[PDB]
Every structure is written in C-alpha cells, then in structure tokens.
Paper text:
The death domain superfamily is a structural motif found in many proteins that are involved in physiological, as well as pathological processes.
Remarkably, we were able to crystallize and solve their structures using MBP-fusion proteins expressed with more than one vector. All of these fusion protein crystals diffract very well which led to their structure determination. Structural analysis shows that the designed “helical” linkers are slightly distorted probably attributed to crystal packing.
Numbering used by the authors: 2 to 470
Write the structure that this text describes.
C-alpha cells in the first residue's frame, strides 16, 4: 500500500525537513516522481509498527542505533552502493550502518551533544559539572539559571552517566556482549546521583523537556544548555550570542556522549527502491543536497567527505567532534530499543523521586541485560497463551487490556492474537507481558490449565536465564 512512482520520506521533527523537502522538489522536477517529506510525532516507533505490515515510508531517517533492530525485523533493504560511491563517505560512518556483515542504510551525518553557553552571561563557562551548583546560585540572584537541558530523554543525561564509568553494552574483542550491561555500576550511579542532587537542590527541575530548555536558553533565561547541531539555527535566529564547547567533566573525567549517525534506510516493502537509491546517492548525498538540509537545521559532521572538508572549518563542528571523540559510537544491535526504554524509565523515576537512584538503575540493569529474551517471552505469550484460548476468552482479555493498550471498539473487534501480543509486549516489556496475561487470566476458571502452564513457561525461561548467567 506504499504507492509506486512516488517517494514518501520520514525524518524527525528536530531535523531540517524543509531543506530535505527542497531536495525532494528538485528530484520531482527532474524525474516526475513526487517526493513527500513527513515528520510524524513518534517516528522511531511508528515506523517499525507500520513497516512490519508493509506500509510506511519508502525512506526512514533516524540515528543508526535503531537500524540493527529494523534490519533483524526484516524492515530494511540491503544497501549495495558501488565502490566509487562508498569512497565518498567516511569509513566509520559506513561502519555505523553495517549489521551482520551487510550495509543496511546510507549514513548522512555524525551527531554528538556539546555544551552550549551564552557568551554574554557566561564568558568563561565551567569546565566541571561540580562547579554548576555554585554557578546556579550566583545566577539565581540575577534572575537567571545556570543550566537547562532535556531531562525526559536519556540521550541528554547519558554523557554524565557514562563519564565515571557507565556503559550500555560492553564492547571487547570487536563484539558487544548483550548480557554485560553497565547501567548500575559505580560510575553510572555516581553520575545519575549528581543529576538528581542538582534537582533536589533546585538547580534544575525534573520536568524540564526539550522545548522548555531550548526556549529558556534562546530567551537568555539560562546560561547553558546541552544540545546537538540541529539546535544551532534557532539560536542564530535569537538574540543570544552563543559558543559551542566541550562538555563539563565529572570526577575529572570527560562527559561521554553517545554518538549518533543520522542514517537513511530503504523500506524493504518499498516498490521504489531504485528511485530511493537515486535520491539518496545522487541528490541528498551531494554537496548541494546536504547544504540544503544543513541551512535549515545543521546536520553536524557530515558523512560526505567533500562537504565535510568545508564544515570542519566551523569551530562549532570542531567542538562537536571533540565531544564525539570523548564519547562512544552507539551500538546498532537490536537490543538498543529495550536499553533506551530501561534507561529512560530509570532517569525519569530517579529525577522525579519515584525511585532512588540505586533502585532505578538496578531495575534498568536487569531490564536491559534480559532484553535478549524478549522474543522468547513474546513467543510464549502468543503460542502458549493466546493461541490456546478460544475467541471468546481472547475477546475478554482484549476488553481488559483496552484502557492500557488504547483499544477502541473497532480495534477490540478486529485485532488478532499476534497484534495483541505485539501491543502488550511494547507496553509490558519482556517478562512483564507474560506476567500481565497471568494476572488477567488467573481468575477465569476455564483458563486454569492455561495459566498453570504459563507460570511454568515463565519459570522455565527464568531458569535458562539463571543458567546462562
Ligand atoms: O533518548 C533516547 C534516544 O536517544 C537518541 O535519540 C536522539 C537522536 O539521536 C538525536 O538525533 C536527536 O533527535 O535527539 C534524540 C534524543 O531525543 C537515539 O538515537 C534514540 O534511538 C533513543 O531513543
């Protein structure tokens, strides 16, 4: 149901989608192929849901960390550029889009967070995180604040969590150990404790989000923010004179941002794969194509060598790359989505006071390190739960799940057992989806045997996890 003879492109709303649309208009004039750029609200999650049914955009843009999961799910076409084209982009950017030996997207640009500071409020910005409480107290006396940044997305807190030792999945001997997670080690706990202490002491508010922090910095209300290159053009438009610099150190160690490569994947369901390749290789990944996007919202350090030679002269790009070199390339492994979910929960719960730092990170550690087992829990839920109950009992469960899963009346009537299994596991990660069905079915007498077996399947998996760990 993707239309043949047209290109639909999805890219996140913080990127230069109007510039990308200009590249699309040029393509349409040359080829007669309409190009429509959209930026739907929850892109990285709408795509895997609609693409799994054969729908969605021809081309999907996101940082490379989500792409290995998309590839494992059969959502992406293999990328096979000629050697001459491969030579046009930096090898480490191709590495970010290589998964299981094959290229699964075109790399576009390299993103890392930097410290952005107001040069008039703060000519000499702090070198350490530890200086920020005293700096905030100074600025509060002048009706200003020291620092505001998005606390709702763990991407922005990760550099501080990683500074003294936190890590996602351990990398050694050229491979990631998806069972060695570094979310609850001493360094991670120290970094998140520092952040939570900033909030407890009223140097930041737990509810600060992207929009609040951007407006506060761009209006001159806060002296510093933490953001990526896409944010610079809105600061240019503002009255604020800003610098982009190395992130503060923590316990004398650099902040370690997770480095993202904005990447463009081709939907395996697209009937326009040849046109998508033409657009990406010969329109976007040219000096003129990247310039059109970059002039809208800066891309960062682009993957195209010819254009990066120009951008590298910008001290904001030098600062981006200095922070990138102190950080780490994100894994692209399929477990990244579950890792980010677990860490998002931990940061939000610790910052808001719903959990201590220790308990929040302990749970995130467990959740991320058991993410490998998510497919097996889903299989148990589908094969030993839903497929073993008649339509009547399935409908009753759908009724009980409707509030939490957002099921309308039509959805309750039409959704099959596979769709419900998928929705449940997204809402109740891993083992929680199986616990949920047990909880709902425990008091239906005709499902007594079904529930008994679900409990044994649940223990059986926990045993295999306890054996393999
Ligand atoms: O916060 C978790 C989130 O982090 C990264 O998302 C970044 C993205 O890479 C940036 O380009 C920009 O859009 O900010 C996002 C954070 O809000 C990961 O790429 C993403 O998968 C993950 O969920």
């Amino acid at each position: 149901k993707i239309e043949e003879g047209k290109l639909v492109i999805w890219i996140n709303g913080d990127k230069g989608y109007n510039g990308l649309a200009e590249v699309g208009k040029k393509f349409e004039k040359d080829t007669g192929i309409k190009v429509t750029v959209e930026h739907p609200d929850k892109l990285e999650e709408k795509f895997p849901q609609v693409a799994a049914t054969g729908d969605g955009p021809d081309i999907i843009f996101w940082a490379h960390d989500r792409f290995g999961g998309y590839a494992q799910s059969g959502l992406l076409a293999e990328i096979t550029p000629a050697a001459a084209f491969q030579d046009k982009l930096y090898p480490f950017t191709w590495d970010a889009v290589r998964y299981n030996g094959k290229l699964i997207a075109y790399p576009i640009a390299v993103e890392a967070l930097s410290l952005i500071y107001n040069k008039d409020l703060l000519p000499n910005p702090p070198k350490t995180w530890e200086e920020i409480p005293a700096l905030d107290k100074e600025l509060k006396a002048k009706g200003k604040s020291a620092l505001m940044f998005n606390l709702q997305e763990p991407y922005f807190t990760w550099p501080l969590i990683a500074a003294d030792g936190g890590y996602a999945f351990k990398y050694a001997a050229g491979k990631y150990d998806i069972k060695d997670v570094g979310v609850d080690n001493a360094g991670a706990k120290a970094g998140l404790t520092f952040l939570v202490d900033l909030i407890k002491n009223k140097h930041m508010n737990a509810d600060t989000d992207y929009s609040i922090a951007e407006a506060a910095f761009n209006k001159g209300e806060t002296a510093m923010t933490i953001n990526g290159p896409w944010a610079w053009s809105n600061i240019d438009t503002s009255a604020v004179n800003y610098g982009v610099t190395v992130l503060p150190t923590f316990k004398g160690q650099p902040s370690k941002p997770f480095v993202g490569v904005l990447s463009a994947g081709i939907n395996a369901a697209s009937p326009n794969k040849e046109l998508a390749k033409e657009f990406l290789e010969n329109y976007l990944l040219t000096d003129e194509g990247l310039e059109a996007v970059n002039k809208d919202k800066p891309l960062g350090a682009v993957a195209l060598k010819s254009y990066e030679e120009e951008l590298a002269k910008d001290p904001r790009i030098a600062a981006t790359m200095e922070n990138a070199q102190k950080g780490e390339i994100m894994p692209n492994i399929p477990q990244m989505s579950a890792f980010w979910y677990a860490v998002r929960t931990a940061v939000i719960n610790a910052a808001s006071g719903r959990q201590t730092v220790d308990a929040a990170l302990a749970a995130a550690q467990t959740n991320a390190a058991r993410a490998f087992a998510a497919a097996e829990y889903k299989k148990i839920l589908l094969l030993k739960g839903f497929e073993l109950m008649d339509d009547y009992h399935f409908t009753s469960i759908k009724s009980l799940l409707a509030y939490d899963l957002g099921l309308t009346t039509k959805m309750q009537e039409e959704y099959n057992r596979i769709k419900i299994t998928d929705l449940m596991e997204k809402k109740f990660q891993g083992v929680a989806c199986l616990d949920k069905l047990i909880e709902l079915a425990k008091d239906m007498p005709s499902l007594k045997n079904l529930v008994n077996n679900l409990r044994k399947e649940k223990s059986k998996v926990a045993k295999k996890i306890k054996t393999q760990e």
